[PDB]
Structure formats: C-alpha cells, structure tokens
C-alpha cells in the first residue's frame, strides 16, 4: 500500500544607444506638450537644488549646474526609461561631502575649492566604472541585499543629517564644520551654544520662507527672495550669508587625479550601490506605472556612463531623484526629450543670466532644502501601519534610521544590510514547531496549536518543525521535540503509551551536516527507548542529503514516506 | 466539499559547588585506579606543554605552570563533567600572545616580562567575567553561531600559525617577531632568508626528535632530551637555545591593572566565546559518551571562575583541551579527583624539582608542540568525505582555515562566523522551484523535475517554491514562476490553454513585507490575463501574515486551501 514513485534519470550599437531606434518611433505630435513646460520648470527648479547640494557636498554653484546638465544630456543619449529624472541626489551629495571633508582634513585646509573637485570627481569616476563593470559582468544581483525598508530608513535618517546641516544656514550662524560619528549631536550642541549670536535678519527671512513655502511656488519663492536680497545692502548692513559669484562658461576638461584612487574606492562602493539601487528601482516602478519595460542592464550602463563623461568635466555623482521625478510627472512629459530642454535651460543659466542669482541668500536655499525633505521625514506617520504588517521590518527600518542619523551614512547602510541578514537568521532560529492533528473526514494534518477539534491518535504523535534544520536551530529542534512527546535521554537514565513519532519535513527547506547528524541522533535515541521515528514529506533535496549522509541503508525500508497520511497508516498497521 | 477547520482562540550552595553533593556520592573503591596514574602522567605531560605555550603566549615557564595548576584546582572545586581536562589551550594561548605582543609594541619593548603578565592576566580576567556574566544572564545561546565546521577550520588554520611560529625553534634561528595580517608568510620569508645561519646542533636534535616522536613516549622523550642537554656545554659550545631558569615558589597575588581594560576587552570577547564554545562542547560530547548529563550553566560558571581566581595569581586563560582530555581518557580516570593529583604533581614541580628542566632546550619543546598538532592538521584527509556530505560546509571550513592562517586568528573567526550566516542566505536565494505532478492512485503531489511518470493536467499548473518568500528571493520567485507557466506581463503588452495556477506554499517558512507584496502583485497580474491563482498549504504564520497584509477580503472566499488536492479539485469544478 506504500506509494511507489520512480526518480528521474540524473544590434550592439542599437542596444548601447536607445535613441537610435527611439527617435524614428518618436512622434512630435504625440510627445509635444509637457516637454516645453518641464524644461523651464524642472530647469529653474534644479538651479536652487544645485546651488544648495553643492554646498552640501562642499563645492560652488557652478559644479552643481555642471552635474545636473551633463547628467540630463548623458541619460537622454543613453537611458531607456521614458519618465526618470537623472540629476543630483541629496543623499549621494551628502556622502560626497563627507568623503570630500575627510580628504580635506587629511590634506589640511590650487585653492581649497579646487581640491574639492579633484576628490569629488575622482570619487564619482570610480563610482561610475563600478556601475559599468558590475553591469557588464552581470553582477547586478547585489541590489537584492538592499530592501525597501532599509533604503527607506537610510533616506529618512540621512534626511535628518541634511536638515541638521542646513540648520546652520536657517539660523544664520557661522558654526564650525563637524564630521565623523555623532556629527548630528555635536552640530546641535554648537547650535544651542551659539544661539545667542544668531543673525536677526537671517532668522527673520528664514522664518518667513518657512511659514510661506511649507503651507504651499518654489520658483516664485526663489525669485521673490532674490529680488528682496538685491537692491539692498543686507549683505553688509545685515551681514547675511550670500551665495556669491557663480563662474560663467565651461572650464577645460580635467582628467581625475589617479593619486587618490585607493582612498576613494571604499566610499565609491557605497556611492555606486545606492546610485543604481535607487535608480533601477524608480525606473522599474515608473515603467510598471505606464505599462512598459526597462532593461536593467541598459539602466546599469546609462547610470554608469552618467558618472564618467561628466566626471571628466568637474562633476560629481548623479542618480535618479524620485523627489524631482514627481515634479516632472506633474508637468506631463511623455518622453526623454523634456530633459534635453531642461539641460538647455540649465545651459541658458550656466553661461547666461548666471549672476542673476548672485544676491540670493543661503537661508532661503536652506529653507528650500528643508521643504523638500518633507516626503522622507513624513515616513514617520506610517510607523504604526508598518508595525501591523511586519514588526521585524519596522525594527530594521528604525535601526537603519538611527544608525544613519547618528553613526555616519555609510556605517548606517552597512549596519542596515547586516542587521536585515541577521533578522532573517533570527527568524530561522527559535522558529515555530508544534504537534499536528487530523482533520475530520479529510486527509489534511494541521497544527493542533492553531486549529480546534483536530483529531489525534494516542501512541502516535506528528511533529512539525517549520524552519530548516541546520547548525543554528539544531538545539532548538531537539529541545522542542523533547518538550513534546517524550525525552528519550531522561527515560533511559531513569531506567538505568507513545510508541511512534512522525516528523513532517514538508516545511524543512534544506539540511546541514549538523541537521543530518541531528536527525540520525534523534532516530537512534528514540529507537533506544522503543520508539520508531518516520520522516514524511521530505523534499527531493532533503532526501538526497539524507541518502548522501547515510541516514538509512539501501536494504532498509519503511523509513521515509511521501505523506503524513501514509506514515500514519503504516504506523497503525505495525502496532496491530 | 471545501475543508472547514476552525482556528483556536487567540540549593544555591549545592548548585554552585558540585563537590558538596559529589563527595558523599564518590566511592574510593569505585574511583581508585587511573586517578594516581593520571596525576603523574598528565602532570609531567603538562610541564612541557606549559613551558612551550608560555613562550607561544609570550611568557616564562613559571606562569604556564601557574595557569595549569590553578585551572585544575578551580575546575575540580567547581566543574561538573567527570572527564574534562581544564588547562592551557594552544589556540587560546596563541591569541593571548597576539594581544600581548600588540600591547608590548604599543608600550615599546617593571621588566618587559613583568608587563606581559599584566596584559596577559587582564585579558583573562575580562574573559572570565564575560563568561560569568553571559552564564548568569542566560545569554549563552551565542554558541549556536559557531558551527563544528568553522570551529574545526579555525583550529586547523591556527595550527599552521603555531607550527610556523615553532619553525623558528626547530631550525635554531633567532628570527625577528612578526605580527599582524600575513605574519605566516613573513615568518616563512625570514626563515628562508636566514636558513644559511641555522644552528647545526639545533637542526640535528630537532631532526632526531621529529624522527623519533612522530612514528611513536613524550615523557621519556622529554627526560632523554633534558639528560642529553645536561652534563654538557652545548648551551655555550653549540650556542643552542635553552629554556633557562624557572622561578620557584608563588609570587604574591596582584590585582589586574584596570588601566588596560578598554584595550583588551575586544580580544577578551573572542577569548571567552571560543573558551566556552570549545568546553561546553567536549564536556557535553564526553558526557553523552559515558551516559550522564552536564549542566551548561554550571559549565559556564566553572569556566568563568577558572579565569578570575587564577587571574589574580599571574595566570592566563584556561580552556578544555580535547588534545589532553584523550591522554587522561586513555589513563582510565573515572572522577575529577585525578585532576587534583595532577595539580599536586604540578605543585610538586612548581616549587620542588623546578630547575631539573633548566638545561632543556627549546627545539625539543617545539618538536613536542609539533607532534601534538597532528590531530588538527590531519583534518585534511577528511576533505573529500566532507565534500560528499555537504559542499557548502566544506567551503565554509576552507574559508575559515585560510582566513585564520593568513589574516590573523580573530579576523579568521569573524570571517568564518559571517560567511556561514551568508552561506545560509545564499542557500535561501537562488533556491529550488519546480512544477508538481500527481502520483497515480494516490493524493501526493511531487516535483515533475525529480520524479518520473507524474500525471499532470492541461490548463492547471502546480508550482512549488522551496525557500521562504522575502526581499532576498522575491525577484527569483517571480522569475521562476514566469519561466514556468506563462509570463503575464509579456502577454498583456503583446495584446495591447493554461487557466489556473496553484502555488504550493507548504515549504514557505515565512513571508516578508516584500513577500506579501510579491504575492499580491502576482495574483493581480495573472488575474489581468485571465488566470486564477490559488495558494495551498499555507502554514498558520503565513496565513496570518496574508490576513494582516490584506491579501484577501473577508467576504472573498475560494482563495486559500489547506491542500493541493483540494485546490486541484476546486479548479476542475470551476472550469466545468
Ligand atoms: O525606497 C527607496 O528605495 C528609496 O526611497 O530610496
Ligand atoms: O570542533 C571543535 O569544536 C573543535 O575541535 O574545537
């Protein structure tokens, strides 16, 4: 009556540049509206964003505009997604500024501003080739190790570090630069220490900008603030911080200095990883939004060469925002030509009307940065909902947040990745394990601890262990099996109803050397007392591992079964 | 015809000192033989072992004897296992010497020998309190993270570092001390560089000792070597290395200097972990050998206080050997009183007949250390057998070996622990997934890729995914499900036989937020084409996660089933 089942016998140019085949398919009438509106809006919007993040990264306004313009042009010539906005990312520029400050401290501070670019571009050039190499060799699976609950706590914690850093500009204080682990608390300490020396004009204008922009517009706010700062001596009479002169034109291209490659490679690893994890994602999510497909390898290449050709022209790393991909969505663009228009607008700003924002203050720039972190720092209102869905994901999110906001961004990403992997390990150990009962008028065996009125038979116990059996939870497996049924060691040492134990191995995913040893020891110990142990519903991998580990002899039979019902039927017959 | 199952409603002194109750139960006639033989043999055997490992740890002979004697006495007064030998461990002394050398270099070299003890005892005192604290708070589960394939590659790699270090003494060379990552290759480089300056007498005696001891005795070899070295001017005429004067008596107890606590704590973590992992183990394995039980918490306490009271008297860390637990096994001791005799013998050596080994050379000590690493360095002959049982365990063992033998011992244990956890992660990702077929004249569904003649029905496909569904393997789950059956995205974008898909969730252990989202997306995408997706055999945890994640509405039914047979039956009826 045993179940008998037999085992089975033991186009390169076209791909590189999407626009080669995308231009003929593009229709001017189909994609006309939104492209013109996006170019001026997104472009005028990326001017403040650029001047600010450049100061966040440790540079001047000109280089932020360089990065944005070159990123847009390169992605248009190389990208595949029809809705993504490749430009400056706040978190990436924060990490760039951290590395730039570290190397500046190492060197000691070719002006100091010039040396920032050499470090800044070199980090980006290494980040780009890392993205190119991992894309070419098809080693892009490393994205699977960064979840959406770690890459949403890293961006909610790094948003506090960007708002703390900007708190200097909002309050009009010339605070010293703070770096390393614990920079957030130290900067706040300096803020409260020097709060008496805050500029009255800077505080007034920052309060007005916060009270206007937050309820609400960004472009008109920038225009109004610049106009108010102009036609006045507040740069001297009020001694308020001013953006200053923005150099015009394009400087000659400079090859990144290869003297700094070994120092900047380690940070470039994190830069490239987050840059492709946060792009290939919002490029796939938006592709699913509009019902089209995006090539992950082509995104790899596009975001890789977006950090090399710009890197030759004094630019830092570029990545998709999803904080300005929404501005261009609201615009209504239906093609990547809009970005070109944006680039054109940036070009129209880069050499022409460049000193028009000379009088623009820094407090307004900080306020603009503040009213754009709203999204990430509002992820707090979703905490109870996250707790309801999954408590461990909530814990991982909070740990990543606290680590990134208090122990540097890079250490706060490595703490997130490792903690998530250990949380999976923690889920494996101390797992669910319970007896099973028979469902009346059926052949289904379910947990007698989760379902009621489950019929069980005296003398036979069915034990289910959900997790895989390996070195981590072998002791837990033995302890649970002994807590249920009987403890063979205790009965043997005491000697010196129950007669059959069935283990349901359906949920066991794999077996380690310790797991094979644990199963053999369990069977031998129970057989010493006079109990027979039958394994049921072992997957083919577990069956092969047991056969390789010599759990049973070839001549021996009546030991492994394909179903719990078959094992129960065999045990009842043997007792008779 | 659906299965309807209802869910269930939502003695302190006696324990501290085993000898209080073990002495009255002890019988002199029952445990008489072996105790006397062990004391002299194990004791005379622990004299060379002590003088050598002390030089391995960076100290003089007197302190090794201190450590061995005090460890034996303390474990007799506190230990529970009746067969374990608590004394000096080669790997532990190697790590102690590494930390001692690091602090010696930091300070710069109270004689230099005296400062070694202050660092040596302080490391041990912190290691002991860590074992005491983790035992008292019942946080001893940390042992589960060190497998028997990592703690057997760490001890096979650290055995090469001990044999390389001893290669200096075998060849009679005064090589400089090498430390840090890559010390093994550097020391071998120095050996080959200075091979021309090797002592002829030291080489001759080391070759003779190697050719005699290895085929075979250790005690008589020590006696013969000491006698040959005595009554001769080879210490001067041949300029051979000599152990030297061993101080007699007991020095006054010295409290460990608390100035070095923060520097030595990090190494003390590894010292305490390996010390209790390699003891509670060979104390449980030997207990199972002789059919008795050992209290893990009492072992925690005994091995913890074995590193505190000795630590007050110029002693370093103590741990069970299982390299001299076999010598005392062969003796035939049946109680812990034998260790006391050993301690007595050590005492008889510590103040009396101490200069009897003054003329003993160091080459013979190195040879004795060499012919005792045989066990760990013979674990190479078991490599093919390990490969047959489990390839991943073999890879973990080799990686731990290479890391410990080439990148320091502590880094080689942390590399082993992390790689094993990632190997479990690697086992989860890229897992097994295949279609299932129906077994004829039964109700068992098995893989159609592993079993032959499995009947399947057109229009209905049963898909099994072995691993848990979470952020790491969500993309793999979607890709596998699309490779089998049909790819809903491609059919939808093309439009712009198969009609039912059953997913067997029996092997799925848990579901992450990404897993719940992946399942919902899969169901929606297939329902768009016109395919119905039914989940079957979901464990109660997965069912609760789906209910919490709002996978199905309360009013909605015919979506989750308790068995694949029930799901198949329902699908056939619906098609009719
Ligand atoms: O969730 C994400 O990936 C993010 O926001 O960066
Ligand atoms: O396997 C072990 O635990 C050892 O030998 O240390």
Numbering used by the authors:
A (entry chain B), B (entry chain A): 52 to 61, 87 to 185, 212 to 318, 335 to 614, 645 to 724
What does the report in the manuscript say about this coordinate set?
Like its homologs, SLC26A2 forms a domain-swapped homodimer. Each protomer of SLC26A2 can be divided into three regions: the N-terminal region (residues 1–104) comprising a few flexible cytosolic helices and loops, the transmembrane domain (TMD, residues 105–540) with 14 transmembrane helices (TMs), and the C-terminal cytosolic sulfate transporter and anti-sigma factor antagonist domain (STAS, residues 541–739).
In addition to its known transport of SO42− and Cl−, SLC26A2 is also capable of C2O42− transport. We determined the structure of SLC26A2-C2O42− without NaCl to an overall resolution of ~3 Å. Instead, we found weak densities outside the pocket, in the core and gate domains interface between TM5 and TM12, which could accommodate a C2O42− molecule. Our model shows that the C2O42− substrate is likely stabilized via interactions with the side chains of adjacent Ser residues, as well as backbone carbonyls from L253. The result showed that C2O42− remains bound for ~65 ± 4 % of the time.
